[PDB]
Amino acid sequence: MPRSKRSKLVTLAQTDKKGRENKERIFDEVREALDTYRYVWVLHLDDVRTPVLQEIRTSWAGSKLIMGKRKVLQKALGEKREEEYKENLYQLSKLCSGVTGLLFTDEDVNTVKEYFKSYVRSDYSRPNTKAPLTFTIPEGIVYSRGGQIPAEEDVPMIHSLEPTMRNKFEIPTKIKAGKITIDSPYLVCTEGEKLDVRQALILKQFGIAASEFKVKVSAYYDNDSSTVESTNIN
Amino acid sequence: PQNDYIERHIKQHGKRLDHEERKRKREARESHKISERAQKLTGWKGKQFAKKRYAEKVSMRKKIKAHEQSKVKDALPTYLLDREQKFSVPLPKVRGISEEEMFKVIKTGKSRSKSWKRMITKHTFVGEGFTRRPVKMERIIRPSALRQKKANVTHPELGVTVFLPILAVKKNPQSPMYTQLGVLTKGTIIEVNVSELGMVTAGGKVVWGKYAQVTNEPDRDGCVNAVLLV
Amino acid sequence: MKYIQTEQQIEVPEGVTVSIKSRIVKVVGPRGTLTKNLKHIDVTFTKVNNQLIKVAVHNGGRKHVAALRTVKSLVDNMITGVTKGYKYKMRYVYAHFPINVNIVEKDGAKFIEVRNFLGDKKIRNVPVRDGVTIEFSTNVKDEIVLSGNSVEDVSQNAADLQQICRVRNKDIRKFLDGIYVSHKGFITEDL
Amino acid sequence: AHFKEYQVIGRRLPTESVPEPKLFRMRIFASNEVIAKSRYWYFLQKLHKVKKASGEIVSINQINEAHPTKVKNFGVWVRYDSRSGTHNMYKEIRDVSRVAAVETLYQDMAARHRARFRSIHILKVAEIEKTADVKRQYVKQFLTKDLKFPLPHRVQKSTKTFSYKRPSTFY
RNA sequence: GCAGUCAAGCGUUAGCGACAUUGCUUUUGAUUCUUCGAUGUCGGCUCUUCCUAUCAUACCGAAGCAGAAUUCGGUAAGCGUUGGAUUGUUCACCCACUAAUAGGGAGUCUGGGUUUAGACCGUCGUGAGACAGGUUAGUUCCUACUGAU
RNA sequence: AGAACUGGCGAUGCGGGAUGAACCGAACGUAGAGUUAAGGUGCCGGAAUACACGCUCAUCAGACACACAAAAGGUGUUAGUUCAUCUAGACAGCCGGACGGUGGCCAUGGAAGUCGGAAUCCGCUAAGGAGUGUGUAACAACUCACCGGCCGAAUGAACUA
């Protein structure tokens, strides 16, 4: 297959791939941190906002946490008994179902669990989850916030996003003289309904982040006791 | 009339539904269309298409190289900065222009049997002292259209060409009778008024004339090129 | 490189059952019946399970291998149409002249009729292809709905209906009257 | 062609006071002993200059296939100069015997690269005994477990100029 | 073109060299009033035939194309491409009307002229003699197609 | 252009090259038998529509005094060289992150990264460009440079015939 193969759309940018060097650095960091701190915790961060993660890091900067590829992190912790860096460390790795998010610290379990339980932040719909609340787009002139606000002050939607609504959000709409308008109100969400990608994108565009994401933890590891307790918070 | 409003109308009707989709489909089909045309565009068109493609590829390569180099990271006075910038002749053993049709024969008289006339088909410089003699004496004829007074002059220094009057011709090889005739005959050495450059030899005696050799062939070109023998 | 064996797997739901002799393919399901001819393609079908069907090419080339991956796609599309059903929506918008659309019963063929397009007096007619039912998109301002079993027939009908409203010798940027496909989907909604 | 394997050796005829010089042995495939000897001298005059007058063939012996019944893969390295100059090339061929593999390689080279017998120089041929040695799909394709495939569009030559049965593919 | 410049590649592998690139290449829509020895017979009438490197009509396409109308790439030879004008040479330019009044080859009735007619003015020579010009006088059924027995 | 040198025509029949006064072969009386050089073995044209390895889709390919419009180009085909990605999950496909000082500094009614322009920092990490683009009066709105959630076994880049 010399010719007619798939072409490329490479674009010039001031950034390059880190390559295997970053993976090796993460491996070494995980290995060092395993013995650096008495307590090791696993945090699931499949979908988390960058500012929230930065704020969490700053709150307990001393309680440094190392993140990376799930498979790479599992290899660093040791998936098998003969590969574990520490005795019975594979139990923590096995319970790591989500994306870690390996936290190393010294404070007792009570402090960590209280911090996890007492913290919660708003988040997008994140489809495959129950609808946080019902929402229907009002008719007439539309607004950037979806109309669930004092629309008398809200700025009308920009014309540039009308094609996005037609194609991306898949919401039938028409174009009017000055502002985007719809002939009839179109429902997009309802209580207890499993949302879809289109609904999530629409909610994110309207800024209705009625959902609330919270840190998820599955277990932790004790350096001395060499035992893993399947602590869970919901 | 009615300045750029068309943008306003586009903003009030917003990118007709099929326009974006059609544009995207055309852009996707652009590669296939170019590949197909690489086989189409037959004689007198495929050559131009290939030349354009080669130029585009060279430009893309040079732009990629510049980006890659950038991603890695003759003193002049304060008033000249930020401003635009073994005695063998350069061309020995010139082509041996033979004594041939170049001395074109023009038939004279109503009955063309006593021409006796020869015409020089080579560029020649004479100057003010031409003074065409009576027609009966025109044994050799140098046409006016083929006479040039200013020849291009250059030197491997600053690459500046300036048209200068031709002063005279001193030595034309290959039967210098041509020298006596004043013909250019590329390979000749001619004097040129170099007063424009104003180069001054040792002793403060400003020079304004130097001998230069014709580089280009004025017979096959409408311009005369020479290089200063400095 | 002249692959000795190449094939693909086709999943047939229990709601339909196909029969493949020499390459004329009949499809029967809850949404009616469909047929297609594939003799020209020169491929071979093979049954490995009651719900799975395989198509294989022996000692073929890239030009012939590509045929397999499109025959599989066509079979999948036919199965979905006979089971899921294909629905097409085509909205039309007019600036000044109110466009009128009606399904005239002339000659039985039921040609799609359009009038008052940009004020043009000439009547434009487009035949309704077999296997696709034309219906109006009630509750949707100025929109028509097309659906059926054959994807190709519906797509060709929509293409003809949108091309018949072409604008000539006019700036497309300023001229907006026409027929544009809204979106592509299925009759079910929510199957 | 139906080449044969000949063991060609040289001696660099002994100069005075230097009896029994170094002996060099070469494995080469040729249709006859004369061609094998000529190729031996051609390679000798390239690896280390020794002319025909200054050398001679110690002996020539035909090498028969050790096991001309086991089907095996063969790794072959090929070098040729056409149209461009010298450049290395590697190929993998599955055949019963080394001579058959060499013949198939020569035919494939002639078909694809238009190379000639003199333009092709045999470098090394190594037998394969286990998987993971072959690195190309077109050879690995035949190593699949229980490989099966029919012959499509089978046709048979007709002895008679005309047939009344309207012969069809069999099937 | 000349002399460089960057240097995709080949290099004895110090030199070459594709594409770009700098200097010739009245900065205030000013007016150059410029149009410089074509030594040759061709020039113009009608009709037919062939090409597209096509002017209109036809086809569709890209445009600050909003229309009118305009700039241009491409398909297309189907049908059209008219009329006056100089000569103190018509190696060519003007403007009536149209949608346009496209470019060539295959030469084929008429007029300059390509040639000895006879003469003249001046050139050149002691002269016959011929011209750097020029004017006058001029004479050049065999085969194939269309109808019929 | 010019020199010495070799062969044929010159003075020449014969087979083939559609035909060529310079090509390939070839030691010219009259006949018979058998084997060849050159050309071939679908018909004119006497001889396999012979075997075997592959290529060739060509809008007038290809069978062309081999001579140059000939250098590249084809998301056309067949075969090979080098460098990296790799089950510390190969390429490609669906989803999220794409931060914080910051709305950098001078230009100034607007340049919040995408009308001007100098460097392009430090804090920060799995990763973030004082920005690649689409589009806005002004951000805003969306994509990748780069990373992760699923997949699921070889992949991407430059060259040669």
- Are the CB atoms for B95 and B185 separated by under 8 Å? no
CATH at residue D102: 3.10.20.10
The identity of residue D71, as a single letter, is: V
C110 contacts: CB under 8 Å, gap ≥ 6: C103, C104, C127, C128, C134
Measured distance CA(C66)–CA(C55) in Å, rounded: 12
Q: Does D94 share its domain with D116?
A: yes
Alpha-carbon gap: D135 to the closest alpha carbon of chain C (Å): 15
Whether residue D161 is contained in a domain is answered as: no
- Are the CB atoms for A215 and A47 separated by under 8 Å? no
Measured distance CA(B221)–CA(B228) in Å, rounded: 20
Chain B environment of A14 (Cβ under 8 Å)? 71
Q: Does D55 share its domain with D73?
A: no
A52 touches strand F (CB under 7 A): no
Q: Does D64 share its domain with D26?
A: yes
Q: Does D29 share its domain with D78?
A: no
Tokens of B23: 């544009």
Q: Does D17 share its domain with D49?
A: yes
- Are the CB atoms for A169 and A147 separated by under 8 Å? no
Of chain B, the end-to-end C-alpha distance in Å amounts to 62
Measured distance CA(D34)–CA(D72) in Å, rounded: 30
Tokens of B4: 């750029």
* B100 DSSP 8-state letter: S
Q: Containing H/E element for C52?
A: strand C52-58
Which site among A17, A158, A175, A179 would you substitute to test the B interface, given the most B Cβ atoms closer than 10 Å to its Cβ? A175
Q: Which of residues 49-78 of D touch strand F (CB under 7 A)?
A: none
Measured distance CA(C69)–CA(C72) in Å, rounded: 5
Query: Which residue range(s) make up the domain with D83?
Result: 69-145
Tokens of C139: 């509750």
Whether residue D82 is contained in a domain is answered as: yes
Whether residue D25 is contained in a domain is answered as: yes
**Length of chain D counted residue by residue:** 171
Whether residue D36 is contained in a domain is answered as: yes
Q: Decide if A185 touches C, using CB distance below 8 A.
A: no
Domain C-terminal end among D68, D93, D116: D68
SS3 of residue B16 by DSSP: coil
Q: Does D76 share its domain with D55?
A: no
Q: Does D60 share its domain with D89?
A: no
Whether residue D168 is contained in a domain is answered as: no
Of chain A, the end-to-end C-alpha distance in Å amounts to 53
* Residue D150 burial by Cβ neighbours in a 10 Å radius (0-12, 13-18, 19+): exposed
D149 and C3 within 8 Å at the Cβ level: the answer is no
Domain C-terminal end among D23, D38, D68: D68
Whether residue D127 is contained in a domain is answered as: yes
Q: Does D56 share its domain with D18?
A: yes
- Are the CB atoms for C57 and C66 separated by under 8 Å? no
Domain C-terminal end among D68, D96, D112: D68
A175 closest CB neighbour out of B14, B20, B64? B14
Q: Which residue of B has its CA nearest to A160?
A: B14
Distance C96 CA to E68 C1' (A): 21
Q: For strands B117-120 and B140-141, give the pairing.
A: parallel
- Are the CB atoms for A45 and A99 separated by under 8 Å? yes
Please tell me the experimental approach by which this structure was elucidated: cryo-EM
Dihedral of CA atoms D61, D66, D68, D69 in degrees, nearest 10, equals 170
Chain centroid, CA A232 distance in Å: 19
Within chain C, residue ranges assigned H as helices are 62-83, 151-163
* Residue A174 burial by Cβ neighbours in a 10 Å radius (0-12, 13-18, 19+): middle
Q: Does D44 share its domain with D104?
A: no
Whether residue D158 is contained in a domain is answered as: no
Alpha-carbon gap: D171 to the closest alpha carbon of chain C (Å): 14
Q: Does D80 share its domain with D104?
A: yes
SS3 of residue D82 by DSSP: coil
Number of domains in chain D: 2
Nearest nucleotide (C1') to alpha carbon of A204: F141
Neighbours of C51 (CB within 10 A): 11
Q: Does D132 share its domain with D122?
A: yes
Q: Does D97 share its domain with D30?
A: no
What structural domains and CATH numbers belong to chain C? 1-85 (3.90.930.12), 86-191 (3.90.930.12)
Nearest to C124 by CA among C137, C114, C132: C114
Protein residue with the closest CA to the C1' atom of nucleotide E123: B136
Whether residue D115 is contained in a domain is answered as: yes
